[PDB]
Design a binder for this molecule. Structure first.
Ligand code: HEM
Ligand code: HEM
Lengths: 145, 145
């Protein structure tokens, strides 16, 4: 249930998400591409899903990858801005869920993003505490897949 | 090209875009739904394209329409944030262009959004000057369609 998952976002979790987002969200282009490139390096078996982006090994130099990456960060910004209202968070999460259900992405594969996020957070000095907080948010999307 | 269209947005245009967005973008749920509902009211022929959203006449009550509307406002937020870097604005614009090209939305049809935006701006007292500024931004997307 996406509703039960959304309920797991307690006061403490929401604070950690906001505090860390102030930092990671300050450079959407750079951190977005870093998240994506890490995903492709750590789980090479997912590259096949992104054929539309072309050669993702080019990183920041790939225009399609950069556009996709920046937009991905705005999806996260969207989630963070809906933390105050469970009903609105749910409706936006289900919106992006569809975008992935159409690409045949399961909850298990969607979860492969936790690794990259934890690595990007660690590079900015945010440890496991924040990684776990973000994992709970990703869990809300997984519940809708 | 899309670059020429984007590279043409002047300082005065960007200023009016940012000033009006500070207001219109402050309530993404309320103004986003207002935009979508206005589009359906004035251009009833577009209703069929949004069958995935269900009964759009339900407005705010429709969770799918609400999720779509809030998300659309973040697409505009994305554009606004990339105004000072034409290279970044272009790659995000082309990304959203693909989303509509896949739905067979022509440049002319995409332009139907100008009416709704003009009316929403007007509801907050932003006149023709501001409406013209937004049509210039919508034109950057049309250059990609
Ligand atoms: C925090 C986690 C993630 C977020 C918020 C997210 C967000 C997005 C967004 C906003 C889009 C564009 C939707 C569209 O225009 O159709 C997208 C596309 C996509 N996502 Fe994700 N995504 C996430 C994780 C993943 C993961 C882990 C995978 C694969 C294992 C995945 C696979 C895809 C694919 C295949 C596309 C289509 C790319 C294209 O052809 O343009 N996503 N995602
Ligand atoms: C200010 C201009 C507009 C913006 C910023 C915008 C933005 C968006 C975004 C973010 C999506 C979701 C893409 C996805 O996840 O697949 C979307 C979907 C869509 N848009 Fe637009 N759009 C605009 C104008 C229009 C207009 C005027 C039309 C109709 C003539 C149109 C037709 C569609 C359709 C049919 C969908 C698919 C909806 C669905 O089934 O989920 N858009 N738009």
């Amino acid at each position: 249930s996406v509703y039960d998952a959304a309920a797991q976002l307690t006061a403490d979790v929401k604070k950690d998400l906001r505090d860390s987002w102030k930092v990671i969200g300050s450079d959407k282009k750079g951190n977005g591409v870093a998240v994506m490139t890490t995903l492709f390096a750590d789980n090479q078996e997912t590259i096949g899903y992104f054929k539309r982006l072309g050669d993702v090994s080019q990183g920041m130099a790939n225009d399609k990858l950069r556009g996709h990456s920046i937009t991905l960060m705005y999806a996260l910004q969207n989630f963070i801005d809906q933390l105050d209202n469970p009903d609105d968070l749910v409706c936006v999460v289900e919106k992006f869920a569809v975008n992935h259900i159409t690409r045949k992405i399961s909850a298990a594969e969607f979860g492969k993003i936790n690794g990259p996020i934890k690595k990007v957070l660690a590079s900015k000095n945010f440890g496991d505490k924040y990684a776990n907080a973000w994992a709970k948010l990703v869990a809300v999307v997984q519940a809708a897949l």
